Amino acid sequence: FNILLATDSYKVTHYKQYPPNTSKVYSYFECREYEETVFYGLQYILNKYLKGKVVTKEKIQEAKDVYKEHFQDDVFNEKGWNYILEKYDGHLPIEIKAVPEGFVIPRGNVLFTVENTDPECYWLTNWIETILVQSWYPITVATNSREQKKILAKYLLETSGNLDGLEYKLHDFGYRGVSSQETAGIGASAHLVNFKGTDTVAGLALIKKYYGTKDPVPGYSVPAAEHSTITAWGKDHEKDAFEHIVTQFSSVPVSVVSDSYDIYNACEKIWGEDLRHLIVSRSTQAPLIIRPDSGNPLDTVLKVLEILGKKFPVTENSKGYKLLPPYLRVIQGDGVDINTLQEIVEGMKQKMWSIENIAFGSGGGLLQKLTRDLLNCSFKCSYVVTNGLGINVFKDPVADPNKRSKKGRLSLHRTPAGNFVTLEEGKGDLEEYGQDLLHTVFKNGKVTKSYSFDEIRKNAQLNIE
Amino acid sequence: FNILLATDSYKVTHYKQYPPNTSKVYSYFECREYEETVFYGLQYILNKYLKGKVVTKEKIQEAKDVYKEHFQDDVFNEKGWNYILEKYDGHLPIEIKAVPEGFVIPRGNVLFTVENTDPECYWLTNWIETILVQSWYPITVATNSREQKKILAKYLLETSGNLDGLEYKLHDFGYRGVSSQETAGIGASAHLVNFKGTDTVAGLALIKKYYGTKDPVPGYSVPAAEHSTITAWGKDHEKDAFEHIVTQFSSVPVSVVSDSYDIYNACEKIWGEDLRHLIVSRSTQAPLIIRPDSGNPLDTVLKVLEILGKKFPVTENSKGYKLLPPYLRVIQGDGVDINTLQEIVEGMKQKMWSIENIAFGSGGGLLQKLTRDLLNCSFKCSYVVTNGLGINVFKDPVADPNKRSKKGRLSLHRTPAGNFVTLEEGKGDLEEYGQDLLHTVFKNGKVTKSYSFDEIRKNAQLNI
Ligand SMILES: O=C(/C=C/c1cccnc1)NCCCCC1CCN(C(=O)c2ccccc2)CC1
Ligand SMILES: O=C(/C=C/c1cccnc1)NCCCCC1CCN(C(=O)c2ccccc2)CC1
């Protein structure tokens, strides 16, 4: 990895574009006015990419060589990068301030700020815009996950009277449906801020290396079947596959995909009649979890439940809702995103089925079907010093007021009612509001303030009680 | 990187689930059921992740230790992975066949197949599903970018006489808009299959390392402003910023974002009146490229062109379409995806503006606004041998016929009309449809067949 090759091409040319006699470029990050976001992921970037000796003589040559061919021109700030190497032993002369990781903050608020600590390195602040803005992803995944936990919480509490097992109600299936290996790790870590169940293994090693937990691992899974693991038996021997798998895993929770050929047959005849004897003998700590995987998600879940309720002993009510026997549960893992999750739980409630009956799995919707536009994650310059004189700067495009950016030196404060407010124009310097809620997390090549994953999870809790 | 920790956790438990006495698991990849896809990206994966000694005693132990806590149990197949280490010096006993990279293939065709080459390693075929399926991404980016080149080609050809400058008409802006550094490299590389213009400076090193070009680099850029380099001058000094930037870059092409405060004022008064003398003096080798960056993408572009054609000398084409003077162009890099790209070029054509006047930039739309559902990229088992007998294997869910998978030994063939067909059930073994078009690209830890990025580009060319 070469930090000199980890920016937008045009930013290689920006040092020649700022006003001459500019000693400071100050920039901030916001989710431009999902009315509330989880700040997560910066610490990963600081450690992996920005910390320590990130500039060497070889990295300067490498970049020089590439940019020459790439631009067909000698645009590249070799002098500027040599200065960092010579004066700071290749450590970035940058200070970053940030709200604690895990903090849940309404949109339109400053989440972190970036400025150079050396007047020569004025160009450096926005060189690292590209890398830092990619924090949009862990933030958006953590936020979207939490918002889905909010819906589950609402309906679990309503139908059941509590929240038992909530943190296992959305399972991460997103590993293969993601753009890369690195994305898998970052994204599965963000989901684990809210839940404890994951099939995306990459996230466990990221967390332990960059954040850490008191617990040996932040995430957990159970034995589960695949379509290959059923279909390999031959279409006439689906029952032999089912029987073999529940028996191999008789003592632990086991999930078995049941829609290879006909899910409704599989539930009514195979599980409900042929193999019922192997199911009803199962421990409460080791349910069979039937996994539908196709058809309309709502329509299929409801039909699966109606089938099963008539083949197995249903109890009712502490809230009036119906509950499968303890050794039998369902997991819906196809076509689940924030939109369809809400339609499924609402449809179940309408049909008198408790949310304690179901868990969800999500792949693409959970990790890949997200974009920087969702929360309008943006990084903009708000303050510059030119000729020893500070000015408050901003953009304000005529045709789009929603793209207007903040002015001057910023700070994040607690309001009298206990909410959040960003102060602009250096106004935080007055003592009218609180202490600044942002902390220096990186300065001159060193991470100066760290958070464990246990603190992050704590910070990102839902209110309910 | 540890390949024992690079799978869906449930696949850790799959070796216990296949029928006893299974010696062969044979699986394939398809874009199930955007009628044609560019096959790109597998080679990166083979080289980065699957080739060489991928298994060590340390990697086995690490995986053992993680999975013990992850499952709260001992389900990890230590014995199976130790057999690889001992027998094959940590090299995977797997064979993969694949269509040549860059190949443009209709949906529903086999693109690659995977099978184990040792009976002991029957569970290994689908262990590497997860990693291989991430192919969906370079394939989907390459396909979507090509589709966008098709639209541009159609409209450039119609409004001007030709396709001059086509390969520079969609610029990659997506570096900050993707999920990671690795994603940036993969995705920008995939866009470069179709175009030469990029600001995503991670795709170049990927291409040189895994694919290679004859030219020093596969992608190019020019000097350009961002809002910070305009806005830092102060609101009242936007003209000073413009003048400074174009003077610093007066002999090369330069893009200048002009919507910091008022895009329409900047074009008509600042570029069109105040600084006109610095624009009209520019070389044809070095146009000023005005960059709008907000508002309705089509309404903005059209008003931008109208403004400018009335401040600068416009010429009318051999096709009847209007053309800015050679030192002035436009790049629209906000809200551009395949849908809005089409609407802009059509709206331009309707108002008699040639596509030679414009280039596009695209960020999240080009590299992030994509899913595995778009082309239905899917890896499925189609053939197994158990107790010495091979059986054709498949799923066929009652409520979704579009999820049905292919049966038995698969093969890709050329039809009598010169099209593609996938033959199932080992029927390719009959000499009826000629030679199998898939090539062995990986076998027993070695890459056996590979392609230059120059070959890939050539394969991915448009008919036009
Ligand atoms: O099925 C898959 C993975 C599928 C997959 C993975 C990757 C790619 N493609 C497909 N994994 C099985 C995970 C189950 C985890 C927990 C066990 C404990 N649990 C209940 O006991 C339960 C309580 C109440 C309601 C339901 C269940 C809640 C769910
Ligand atoms: O504006 C940006 C980058 C913006 C950005 C990057 C990253 C993130 N956010 C924003 N870059 C300048 C790109 C120009 C590249 C080529 C030069 C040659 N060229 C024409 O001469 C031309 C011919 C016909 C029509 C138009 C132009 C075609 C376009």
Swiss-Prot record, chain A:
Positions of modified residues (Phosphotyrosine): 168
Q: Which GO terms describe its biological process?
A: cell-cell signaling; circadian regulation of gene expression; inflammatory response; NAD biosynthetic process; positive regulation of canonical NF-kappaB signal transduction; positive regulation of cell population proliferation; positive regulation of ERK1 and ERK2 cascade; positive regulation of gene expression
- Write down the Gene3D superfamilies for this protein, in alphabetical order: Aldolase class I
Transmembrane segments in this chain: where? none
Provide the tissue specificity: Expressed in large amounts in bone marrow, liver tissue, and muscle. Also present in heart, placenta, lung, and kidney tissues.
Provide the positions where the record notes the PTM Phosphoserine: 452
- List locations, semicolon-separated: Nucleus; Cytoplasm; Secreted
Q: How is its activity regulated?
A: Inhibited by FK866. FK866 competes for the same binding site as nicotinamide, but due to its very low dissociation rate, it is essentially an irreversible inhibitor.
Q: Does the keyword ATP-binding apply?
A: no
Q: What is its EC number?
A: 2.4.2.12
- What top-level branch of life does the organism fall under? Eukaryota
Q: Which InterPro entries match?
A: Aldolase_TIM (IPR013785), DUF5598 (IPR041529), N/Namide_PRibTrfase (IPR041525), Nicotinamide_PRibTrfase (IPR016471), Nicotinate_pribotase-like_C (IPR036068)
Q: Which residues bind diphosphate?
A: 176, 227, 291
Keyword Transmembrane listed? The answer is: no
What cellular component terms from Gene Ontology apply here? cell junction; cytosol; extracellular exosome; nuclear speck
Q: Report keywords, A-Z.
A: Acetylation, Biological rhythms, Cytokine, Cytoplasm, Glycosyltransferase, Nucleus, Phosphoprotein, Pyridine nucleotide biosynthesis, Secreted, Transferase
What function is annotated for this protein? Catalyzes the condensation of nicotinamide with 5-phosphoribosyl-1-pyrophosphate to yield nicotinamide mononucleotide, an intermediate in the biosynthesis of NAD. It is the rate limiting component in the mammalian NAD biosynthesis pathway. The secreted form behaves both as a cytokine with immunomodulating properties and an adipokine with anti-diabetic properties, it has no enzymatic activity, partly because of lack of activation by ATP, which has a low level in extracellular space and plasma. Plays a role in the modulation of circadian clock function.
What PANTHER family has UniProt attached to this entry?
Answer: NICOTINAMIDE PHOSPHORIBOSYLTRANSFERASE
Protein name, UniProt field = Nicotinamide phosphoribosyltransferase
- Source taxonomy: Eukaryota, Metazoa, Chordata, Craniata, Vertebrata
Instruction: Please state the gene responsible for encoding this protein.
Output: NAMPT
